[PDB]
Design a protein around this ligand. Sequence first.
Ligand SMILES: Cc1cc2nc3c(=O)[nH]c(=O)nc-3n(C[C@H](O)[C@H](O)[C@H](O)COP(=O)(O)OP(=O)(O)OC[C@H]3O[C@@H](n4cnc5c(N)ncnc54)[C@H](O)[C@@H]3O)c2cc1C
Ligand SMILES: Cc1cc2nc3c(=O)[nH]c(=O)nc-3n(C[C@H](O)[C@H](O)[C@H](O)COP(=O)(O)OP(=O)(O)OC[C@H]3O[C@@H](n4cnc5c(N)ncnc54)[C@H](O)[C@@H]3O)c2cc1C
Lengths: 615, 619
Amino acid sequence: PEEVDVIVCGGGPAGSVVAGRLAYADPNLKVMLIEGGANNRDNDKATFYVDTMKSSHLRGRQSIVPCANILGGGSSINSQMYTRASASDWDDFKMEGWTANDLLPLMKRLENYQKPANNDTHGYDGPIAISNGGQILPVAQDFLRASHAIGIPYSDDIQDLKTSHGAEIWAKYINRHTGRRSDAATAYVHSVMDVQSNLYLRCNARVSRVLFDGNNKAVGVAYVPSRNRASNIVETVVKARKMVVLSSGTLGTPQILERSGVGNAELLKKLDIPVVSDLPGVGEEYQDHYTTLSIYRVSNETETLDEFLRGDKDTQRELFAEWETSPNKARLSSNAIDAGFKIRPTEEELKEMGPEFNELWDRYFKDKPDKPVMFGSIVAGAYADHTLLPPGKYVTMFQYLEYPASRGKIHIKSANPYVDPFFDSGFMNNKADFAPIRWSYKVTREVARRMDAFRGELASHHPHFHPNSPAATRDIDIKTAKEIYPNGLTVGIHMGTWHRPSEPFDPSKVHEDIKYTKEDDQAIDDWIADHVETTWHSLGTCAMKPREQGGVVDARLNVYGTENLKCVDLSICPDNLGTHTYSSALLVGEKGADLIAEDLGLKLRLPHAQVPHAP
Amino acid sequence: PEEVDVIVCGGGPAGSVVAGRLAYADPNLKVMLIEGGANNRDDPWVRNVPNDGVNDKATFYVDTMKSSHLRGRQSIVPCANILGGGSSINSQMYTRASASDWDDFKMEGWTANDLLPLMKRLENYQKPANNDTHGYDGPIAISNGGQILPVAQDFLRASHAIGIPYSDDIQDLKTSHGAEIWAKYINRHTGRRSDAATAYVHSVMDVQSNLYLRCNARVSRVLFDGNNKAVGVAYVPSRNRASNIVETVVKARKMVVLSSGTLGTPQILERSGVGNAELLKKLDIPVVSDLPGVGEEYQDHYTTLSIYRVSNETETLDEFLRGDKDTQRELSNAIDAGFKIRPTEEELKEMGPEFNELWDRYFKDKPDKPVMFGSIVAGAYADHTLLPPGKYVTMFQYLEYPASRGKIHIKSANPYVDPFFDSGFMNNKADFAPIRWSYKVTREVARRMDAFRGELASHHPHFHPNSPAATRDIDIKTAKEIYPNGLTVGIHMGTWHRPSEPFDPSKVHEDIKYTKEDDQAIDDWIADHVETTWHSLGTCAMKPREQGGVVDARLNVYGTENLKCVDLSICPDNLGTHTYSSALLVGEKGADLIAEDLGLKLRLPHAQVPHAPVPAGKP
Ligand SMILES: Cc1cc2nc3c(=O)[nH]c(=O)nc-3n(C[C@H](O)[C@H](O)[C@H](O)COP(=O)(O)OP(=O)(O)OC[C@H]3O[C@@H](n4cnc5c(N)ncnc54)[C@H](O)[C@@H]3O)c2cc1C
Ligand SMILES: Cc1cc2nc3c(=O)[nH]c(=O)nc-3n(C[C@H](O)[C@H](O)[C@H](O)COP(=O)(O)OP(=O)(O)OC[C@H]3O[C@@H](n4cnc5c(N)ncnc54)[C@H](O)[C@@H]3O)c2cc1C
């Protein structure tokens, strides 16, 4: 059509939630969802943002933040892990109607908890399927025992919005009955489109800008094809009688806004864009979660995912056969990340994390006991290029920083919707971020060394310690290297002294913590600098806070200085969230659905449409 | 027996030559050869030196103390522990020192031209020789192997490309800058490795009965009389199984000869009373002659290995070392080509004070001495349980005339206690500069090969990731062939690497530029990964006593009579060569000397070696 009641820009979890809830609320309400990626009903599935300028913090790297480019948003790109923020995280939006207790009903509204529940903070009549997957791999349980061994208590639920130090069997966004991944679009959008026809889906359309009024009321939206295949660039305009909603994700929305005339005035002046609203905060304060990976070598008897990732024929054939014939309990019906923890440093440990982190701590964490500092978890395999990986089997300690101090930004460089924006990831531009990440490298390491499967550290993919230091990396025992190439000459030739072998596995071993110097710390810092990467949990470019502090949206997610325009995706978060952020994006979407429901005098219909090929 | 004419301690190449030549000289002369290792007429049979517990063919000396020069490492120097000595535990390479090396012994009768007839006397050169420095009616059979692996031709082409000229012979005592197809210690007719014992000793025992051979016996010391004449030798079994140590003694009517190798002989001497007097007095060993040079000035060739990754179409030795595909059963030493190189005056300017001083004093006026050796191993000379999948080649490079010196000293009169040992690796800073230089050169060579498909980052210096000289690992195109449906190839997540640009034959090449911090990265890499080449020499120097010498110009231990050292330990300075040919030569000269000293005539040609047809006796 040319005119609809509500236009929602972007098919992320947020946009999908808004469009779905609203369209299902009233068959009269005509909403349209404009998405720049392909329809997912059935690489190029992500758009890649690169640091425009080399970062001095990352030792001359240009960090790359890829984000989703498909219907369903990030939820269509992986078998995802289930995590929720701590309650203080929302209570700290300091925004009316967004407190923990405010959002709790909604946290429940969107969940289909298929697990046994250790508390009363989950939901069951929601579209989004949450389960533990097929089966738990033994390495994970091993990880849990070692973790318990060093003071990380086992818990049956670490997502009760209150646990900050604990480990668990990590649940996944995968339906337990059918074994299919739970993206937001099929759960919220396609489910509706199959039973109603007032939800218009317009994919492969990159929203260029918002069309405004004389009184700055959102009147419509102009979109251009997703790829720039023509000599001329042509806008399709579609009007919105009631509401325009921007859900193009953290990297996506501030560009729409800035090229609509909403943003920093000085920039728009530089860019020949008529100014609609002066908001220097648009695109600023970019936040993320910083990932480091510690790769360790394990006994060959261990069940890991490596043959699959290398691509052996009979193993890929066997596992695909199994995920085909019995997805109910199939190992491939998992993300092979079956266990992890949220951890916090002890007042004893704090004494060694420096001025910078102690300031950040005293200020941010000290009074909020439910906020974790770090996340860690065990990947039954090596999350790295296997053509640079020695033969054998691995696990990976996947760890990320929960609430980084560093900030980045993204700003358009042209009014043209097809030009790359200026981007600064911001990774490590605040020194107070090295200290906790460093700590994790240590913590996880300890855990790895206490596992029944641990057979060594992968020297190359670990920090570059001074060889003579007690903290050096010890690689595989001769026994395991012998079982890897039994009839192989060369195993164990010391010629070159290319490694230092571990003493073989004596389960009757008592462990003493590795002692680290300042020099060793500097090695870990360099490693962190060299290899830290995004976690794809981008947020905060269109912050929700008072304008005078640099906000862009209302307590009702209305863009300041306009009417009928809302930003409801992850970009609105004023401060970071201690979680994998899909659950957050869904929650922000649900809240947004509520707000727009209120604004339009609408009553949401629940429960939602039956998700396709689902019970 | 309890009495023989000549006792020889150690069955190495030198010791084998002495025993064989003498026993064959006069059938009446009863000689006995005592070896601390096993007999080498093997049953089962480079991969011959790792401590697997299954290594009984080598003894491992470990640095008593950690080396600050080597960033806290204790270097490990393995030596041969078997009859034939080092010549029995590998597929051997043929190399000769340059003539300046011998001329510089400054010992009468050890000049290059003096020894040349001896050099020919031992060679059975079976490749065509386009010069006049080889022998043809000699025992040790030398050839070029069958055919050359393609990567070697590749390497040679690259070498020429950076100015290392091709030569048909690098072992003519005269070249210091050139490359060649490397010839080996293998008989071309029968395809068998020509170790020194089976060539010189076993040939005699098969035809005569006056050469007694005693294996598994560790010569503990020399028995001296009142005028410090060697009367015999005391030896113990080499496996210290017995609860008590009982010495077996055998007397010597004519001569005692010590040939137990560079790490072995100075110990015998020290437990005999010949050595640092303060030391022995500390060890309650009665002093026979104070010779502080004994056990001192240990020299070697320092090896570093550069591993580079190559294309999968390439034929290398790797699948073999991995053992896969029943190829170990189906199946040269796969080091078929290399070079001797010397730095150009322009390059000298970037090598620093220490080495430039060394250059002015040592190399400047002697144009035939190469500074570095390099060669290509068609496979990765490294632990494959630490190597990413795929195929590799490695630049095997060693320093020809190192400045560092180490030492070895007994720690007790007990023959079964490990001695104090210091490899000495890199304790003279003038040793870093050339190796680093070499690291650079080979890399360039490596970058210019048609098979080169990347550098193995892990095993290369730790260059700053952002430096232009950082290493770029395998290109994505090859990594794809390694795992066609592999879900992880080309994942950028982690930035653990920087991939190399894929192969276009029409590419023009520019030398890599290095900084001072990049130079330091390489100094640290060198310090971290430098290893011996098993070319140990010099612990019992041949020079005037007042300079710290131990032996005569005729190899007699100072302060005694009827005692000689005939092995590599007598070399006063290093030799720009793999040292087997050198060890054989020392042996021949010693045999000659002992021949004159006892009024004997060597019988030439030698006893016919087992498993050979009649020797050609002409090109
Ligand atoms: C590989 C990957 C793995 C992830 N794994 C997890 C996990 O395991 N657990 C977890 O909790 N979270 C995970 N996430 C993140 C999670 O998906 C996001 O945080 C969540 O989806 C946020 O939703 P969003 O709506 O805010 O942004 P998005 O989901 O990114 O929404 C982006 C959508 O809007 C489209 N769009 C963008 N720009 C425009 C434009 N100008 N015009 C029109 N449309 C546009 C986008 O192309 C896309 O369709 C992962 C993300 C990635 C990339
Ligand atoms: C693995 C290896 C590979 C090599 N490859 C090459 C090559 O390819 N090309 C080349 O030119 N050179 C090569 N060499 C070097 C060459 O083999 C030696 O340098 C040469 O043998 C030196 O001879 P030697 O007289 O010093 O006796 P050695 O070979 O050094 O050994 C002397 C003998 O004396 C015995 N012995 C030692 N101590 C005692 C003791 N107390 N009492 C009684 N007996 C004792 C030992 O068992 C030994 O057999 C290699 C060496 C090694 C270890």
